[PDB]
């Protein structure tokens, strides 16, 4: 239901930061593992959000470290 709205300049800033972060990552990493597609096999069902995901903590997002 929620509409995904953002302060435009702020939004740009965020994307800019991710643009530079991403670019940095590209720079540094010798190889860059991509995701295999599709992610799951036809036998593997849509795993439950509660049973698998809701317990485990997510990795750190992309954002260049700011002074």
């Amino acid at each position: 239901n929620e509409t995904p709205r953002v302060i435009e300049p702020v939004y740009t800033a965020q994307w800019s930061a991710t643009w530079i972060a991403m670019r940095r990552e590209k720079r540094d990493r010798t190889h860059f593992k991509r995701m295999r597609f599709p992610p799951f096999d036809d036998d593997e069902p849509p795993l439950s959000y509660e049973q698998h995901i809701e317990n485990i903590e997510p990795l750190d997002p992309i954002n260049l470290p700011l002074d």
Binding site: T30, H31, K33, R34, R36
Partner: peptide, 26 residues
């Protein structure tokens, strides 16, 4: 040289594979 550019794995030491061995050697 297409399949070289596609190569999901390219230009690497087995830093991720050594971590798998480390996880299983444990």
């Amino acid at each position: 040289d297409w399949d070289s550019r596609k190569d999901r794995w390219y230009g690497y030491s087995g830093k991720e594979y050594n971590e798998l061995i480390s996880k299983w050697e444990r």
